Amino acid sequence: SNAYTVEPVTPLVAAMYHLPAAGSPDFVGLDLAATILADTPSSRLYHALVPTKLASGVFGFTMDQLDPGLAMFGAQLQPGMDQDKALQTLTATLESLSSKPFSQEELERARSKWLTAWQQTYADPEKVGVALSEAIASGDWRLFFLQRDRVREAKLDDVQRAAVAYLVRSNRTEGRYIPT
Amino acid sequence: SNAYTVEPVGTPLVAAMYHLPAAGSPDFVGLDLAATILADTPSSRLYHALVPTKLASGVFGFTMDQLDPGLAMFGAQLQPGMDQDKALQTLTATLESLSSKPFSQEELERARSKWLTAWQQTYADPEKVGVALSEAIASGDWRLFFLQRDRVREAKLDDVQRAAVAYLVRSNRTEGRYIPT
Amino acid sequence: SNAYTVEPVGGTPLVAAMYHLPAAGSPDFVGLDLAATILADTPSSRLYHALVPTKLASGVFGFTMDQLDPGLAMFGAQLQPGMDQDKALQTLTATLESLSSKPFSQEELERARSKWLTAWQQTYADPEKVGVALSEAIASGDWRLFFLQRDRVREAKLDDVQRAAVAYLVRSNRTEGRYIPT
Amino acid sequence: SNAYTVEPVTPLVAAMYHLPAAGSPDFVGLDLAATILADTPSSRLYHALVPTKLASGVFGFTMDQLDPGLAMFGAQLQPGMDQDKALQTLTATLESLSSKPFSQEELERARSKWLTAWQQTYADPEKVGVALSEAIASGDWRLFFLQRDRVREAKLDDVQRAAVAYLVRSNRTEGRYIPTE
Amino acid sequence: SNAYTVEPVGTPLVAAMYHLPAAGSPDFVGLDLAATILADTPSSRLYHALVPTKLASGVFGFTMDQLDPGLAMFGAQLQPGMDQDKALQTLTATLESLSSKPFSQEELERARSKWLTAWQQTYADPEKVGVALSEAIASGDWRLFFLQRDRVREAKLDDVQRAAVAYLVRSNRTEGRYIPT
Amino acid sequence: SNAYTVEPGGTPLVAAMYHLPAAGSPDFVGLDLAATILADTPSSRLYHALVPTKLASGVFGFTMDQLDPGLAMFGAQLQPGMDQDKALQTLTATLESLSSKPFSQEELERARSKWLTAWQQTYADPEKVGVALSEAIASGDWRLFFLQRDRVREAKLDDVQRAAVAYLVRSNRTEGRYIP
């Protein structure tokens, strides 16, 4: 999944987490969770960061073409903002979701997002060819199809379990971009 | 603006078409954004009204000011057997009774973001900007491409609610059915 | 439908034959849409086979253009310097206007049908593209057309596509033209 | 042609000029001219407007799908920038090319840009169909190839002559967009 | 090559992949072209063997050289309740019994047209070309981007035939099933 | 950067490849930009030395960071008749003689604007940004997607001149030729 949401109204902080096995319920869980966490102003990080003036915009990606595969969350700040506080709020928000469980509505939003994208990919043999090759490079051709099936059958508590299981300190690495 | 959301799982369709306000009206942006709250994502007024209820398999909303007259089109795709008169009726009553379920600020922010994200994609592409400018001239004012953006940027909930309420009425409504024969 | 098929081997003369489309609401419209792909698209197309292995042409093309009023179908051939433009135009129009004695095969229809439906599914999977296709159907006079054209294509019989091409690809509807560079 | 070049780093001014018919041997001259005037940091408009802090960016398009067809040039400014000066500098630049004629280098850059986009169009059957359709809507299907040929054969003097002939005060309309802050 | 063809008028899949010869070997393009004869459009060998027999609903075939080893993968899209054993065995047989049903010139021509049209689209876009040259160099030979093209242009029926029968072999096969949970 | 510019046995081509500096090196952006000036549009150095004079029908220039080691590739497309050795001597001398004909400020602005235009188009599209951050991570540092845009923004003529002259030298030149 790919999310980058910036306010209507450049330093950057990031946090990255190792993903589970490509073919698992947890992987599809965190793919969906990343959308809920970073996509649109309704998302967890935007709501946590922007209205409160700690960040100018937020993003969340799951990057399966890396080995290790990574989920990467972050925020772009304005010139004079507090990187320390921005990074602490970001990781706090991401790592404390048993305190703030996903809603069915949020799950549905992400599921719909994910499946829209798969359908555009499938309708196009050029895109299907790339995706299948990414599947064989991940280890199994069936993944392309398997993952769609996981996403259609995903219940709220799997996705809750995936994110709580993987968005944890022991699996966190931080970054900041501080320009010259 | 552009919305089509279906359920995660030939096909009969029902549609309601509304005339838009003039592109230069300070209600035009109201409707654009309204169509998104109304028809985009599982969270939209139409999806929620038509799909868990099993009245339709998916919903859409489009504003197409490339036409004369300019139009908003909202519709639902049904399954083979679903009651077509029930889907249409629910469809229109959803669109036309927003005074009874008013837009939230969160709904607006959701629609404003999508709109501005689309505008910035147009803007970064000189080919798309040239198209967007000549469409603005075709609607009678080259400024409109930037004016629309500034109006979305400054759009207040009060103004979006009023525009949708003034324009999504039965007297501005043209119904359509497509029944694969 | 849109097709431009070239071979793998002054400037380049082009000859062309123009015909008119049926109304977009007519059964025939998709017939002619599917036909132009059979006539003009890939080395297996009727035009390509008549003009290119025979060395009359460098490539062939076929487009249906309903954004015009009148709506127009355009077929043509790309020439090399030295090739007879009249003999090309001669053969191009003979192929188009004699399908009556050279009827589409089931397999040809399936080739054009598969292409058409793939394009349709790609359009439908994108809200942006659907919004455009819907506005074009409205402009055409029936928002239903976006879906109806699809339904008509998936159910397309060989006899109906033949009859459509045979009634529209006729000399009385035909206007020839040529581009010679410089 | 399409051009929009901004400073590496919502007010706007614009001037718009009627185009000759597509089949006039003036019409590609203006196409190429517009690129010279409006594309990249080497453009006549960028040079006059941007280092001088009258605009953050400039643009220029030929819009042949309008009737009447237009050449549209314009500038985007930051809020405190003098609108009247940017606008007078823009038009002055466009309408005084007899005192600063095109160089062969400029024609070459802009000719390569045109022919590159034409080749990109030509390689896609879908884009060809639309271009052929627009040529027929402009007056003649042959214009699609014939404009390529003219661009290929375009001499500096013809491009000079067409710009100078059509970019004059009797052929232009002005505009400003002053946002409602 | 890419091929994915489905019947017009929650689904299992059965497949078979084979190792390609090295990119730079002469048989490499034969197999690229072969998979198109085999898998692309309703006239393809897989389609005739699996769709009218109602042994499959759609077929695909792709050669993926970015992979190491490179593979050609062929497959069938199934309906719940269709014979999976039979589909795969008819699939694997079709791909392995080509010598009894040799490729026709017309089939070669079709495959070549598609290959070169795609190659021309890559060459037309600097960014794609750079990507393609970059893969060439990773193969250990920049020239390959250009050589493959010339190889395809020259390709003879006899060699495309031998390449396929040399490589689409039970010796070189790995088999797959995807059944929905 | 990617550039291929053509004029209005089969097609032979000749090439010269040079190792790029590290992506995080302050010379990387320099060479990215220099490739544009050297090979993009008729006004490019290679086009001017090779095309008007008829030693080639087109020229090209890429920097390919996704390789290990990263390369600048330059080349020329010839007509069936032309002399390959001459094209290659003229291509290499141009590339290796930039002390003699320094980049202008104008050249640089055209290169920088091209580069930044392509960055804003990526940045505008959340899918594109995700891919670009993956390469950045694969290149060994996520911050590069941004740092390189800041670096292009601030790139001065003399740094760009110096980067190009330092890397486009006889000791870094591997030649190649394609003759059908």
The partner residue sitting opposite A125, judged by closest CB among E2, E67, E178, is: E2
CA distance D69 to D62: 8
CA distance E45 to E74: 11
CA distance F42 to D108: 7
Distance between start and end Cα atoms, chain F: 28
The approach used to solve this structure was X-ray
CA distance D13 to D83: 7
E121:D123 CB<8 A: yes
Are the C-beta atoms of A55 and A77 separated by less than 8 Å? yes
Please check whether residue C42 touches E, CB under 8 A: yes
Nearest CA in chain B to F124: B121
E121:D119 CB<8 A: no
For the sheet with E58-64, list strands across it. Answer: E2-6, E58-64, E71-77, E13-19, E173-178
Please check whether residue D123 touches E, CB under 8 A: yes
Please check whether residue E38 touches A, CB under 8 A: no
Residue B61 in tokens: 């909303």
Please check whether residue C55 touches B, CB under 8 A: no
B88-107 CB burial, b ≥16 within 10 A, e <16: bebbbebbbebeeeebeeeb
Chains touching chain D at 3 or more Cβ pairs under 8 angstroms?
A: B, C, E, F
For the sheet with C59-65, list strands across it. Answer: C2-6, C59-65, C72-78, C14-20, C175-179
Question: Chain A partners of C124 at a C-beta cutoff of 8 Å?
Answer: 123
Query: Angle at Cα A141 formed by Cα A135 and Cα A144, nearest 5°?
Result: 60
- CATH assignment, C1-182: 3.30.830.10
Question: Chain E partners of A142 at a C-beta cutoff of 8 Å?
Answer: 13, 176, 178
For this experimental structure, what is the resolution in angstroms?
2.2
Q: What are the distances in angstroms from CA C86 to CA A30, C91, C94? A: 66, 8, 12
Query: Where does C63-168 have alpha helices with state H?
Result: 85-97, 106-124, 127-140, 145-155, 158-168
The partner residue sitting opposite F2, judged by closest CB among E126, E137, E138, is: E126
Q: Residue E118 contacts by C-beta under 8 Å, 6 or more apart in sequence?
A: E1
Domain ranges within chain D, ordered by starting residue: 1-181
Please check whether residue C121 touches A, CB under 8 A: yes
Residue A88's Cβ-side half-sphere holds a number of Cα atoms within 13 Å equal to: 4
Q: β-strand E58-64 against E71-77: which pairing, if any?
A: antiparallel
B111-141 CB burial, b ≥16 within 10 A, e <16: bbbbbbbebbeebbbbeebbbbbbbbbbbee
Please check whether residue C9 touches A, CB under 8 A: no
Question: Chain E partners of A126 at a C-beta cutoff of 8 Å?
Answer: 2
Are the C-beta atoms of A144 and A135 separated by less than 8 Å? yes
Element containing residue E75 per DSSP (H, E):
strand E71-77
Dihedral sign from CA coordinates of B148, B41, B66, B25: negative
Q: Residue B111 contacts by C-beta under 8 Å, 6 or more apart in sequence?
A: B33, B34, B36, B37, B40, B160
Q: Among D10, D18, D176, which would you mutate to test the B interface (most chain B Cβ atoms within 10 Å of its Cβ)?
A: D10
Question: Chain B partners of C134 at a C-beta cutoff of 8 Å?
Answer: 62, 64, 73
Chain D nearest CA to C101, separation (Å): 29
Domain A1-180, second-level architecture: 2-Layer Sandwich (3.30)
CA distance C64 to B148: 35
Nearest CA in chain D to E117: D123
D125:C14 CB<8 A: no
Question: Chain A partners of F146 at a C-beta cutoff of 8 Å?
Answer: 10, 12, 177, 179
Chain F nearest CA to D9, separation (Å): 8
E strand residue ranges, F30-173: 58-64, 71-77
Angle between helix F28-39 and F144-153 (nearest 10): 60
B62:C130 CB<8 A: yes
Q: Which amino acid does the sequence have at E1? A: S
Residue A60 in tokens: 């969340």
E 61-120: CB under 8 A from C: 106, 109-110, 112-114, 116
E120:D123 CB<8 A: yes
Are the C-beta atoms of C179 and D142 separated by less than 8 Å? yes
Chain A nearest CA to C126, separation (Å): 7
CA distance C52 to C37: 17
What are the phi and psi torsion angles at C28 (to 5°)?
-55, -25
Question: Chain F partners of E126 at a C-beta cutoff of 8 Å?
Answer: 2-4, 60, 62
Element containing residue D166 per DSSP (H, E):
helix D156-166
Query: Angle at Cα E103 formed by Cα E102 and Cα E106, nearest 5°?
Result: 140
Return the bridge partners of D75, or none: D13, D58
F126:A3 CB<8 A: yes
CA distance B8 to B41: 12
Question: Chain B partners of A41 at a C-beta cutoff of 8 Å?
Answer: 106, 109-110, 113
Q: Residue E39 contacts by C-beta under 8 Å, 6 or more apart in sequence?
A: E3, E4, E5, E45, E46, E47, E59, E60, E61, E62, E74
Question: Chain B partners of D38 at a C-beta cutoff of 8 Å?
Answer: none
Are the C-beta atoms of C81 and C13 separated by less than 8 Å? yes
Q: What are the distances in angstroms from CA D48 to CA A39, A61, D44, D75, D108? A: 42, 42, 6, 11, 21
Q: Which amino acid does the sequence have at B31? A: L
A11 cis-preceded (ω within 30 degrees of 0): no
The partner residue sitting opposite F112, judged by closest CB among D8, D111, D113, is: D8
- CATH assignment, B1-181: 3.30.830.10
Dihedral sign from CA coordinates of C155, C158, C161, C167: negative
What are the phi and psi torsion angles at D111 (to 5°)?
-70, -40
Interface size between C and E, measured as CB pairs under 8 A? 33
Q: What are the distances in angstroms from CA A22 to CA A62, A122, A132, B5, C172? A: 11, 19, 13, 27, 63
CA distance D145 to C10: 14
DSSP string, D35-71: HHHHSSTTSHHHHHHTTTTS-SEEEEEEETTSSS-EE
Element containing residue D161 per DSSP (H, E):
helix D156-166
3-state class of F159 per DSSP?
Answer: helix
Residue D24 in tokens: 């006039």
F176:E127 CB<8 A: no
DSSP string, C29-88: HHHHHHHHHHHHSSTTSHHHHHHTTTTS-SEEEEEEETTSSS-EEEEEEE--TTS-HHHH
Are the C-beta atoms of C166 and C92 separated by less than 8 Å? no
How many residues does the structure list for chain E? Answer: 181
Are the C-beta atoms of C88 and C77 separated by less than 8 Å? yes
Residue B118's Cβ-side half-sphere holds a number of Cα atoms within 13 Å equal to: 20
A133:E66 CB<8 A: yes
Question: Chain A partners of B8 at a C-beta cutoff of 8 Å?
Answer: 111-112, 115, 151-152
Does chain B reach chain C with at least 3 CB pairs under 8 Å?
yes
Residue B58 in tokens: 């998916």
Question: Chain C partners of D118 at a C-beta cutoff of 8 Å?
Answer: none
Does chain C reach chain F with at least 3 CB pairs under 8 Å?
no
Interface size between C and D, measured as CB pairs under 8 A? 39
B26 cis-preceded (ω within 30 degrees of 0): no
Question: Chain A partners of F126 at a C-beta cutoff of 8 Å?
Answer: 2-4, 59
DSSP-assigned letter for residue F110: H
Question: Chain F partners of A177 at a C-beta cutoff of 8 Å?
Answer: 143, 146-147
CA distance D46 to D38: 7
CA distance C127 to A160: 30
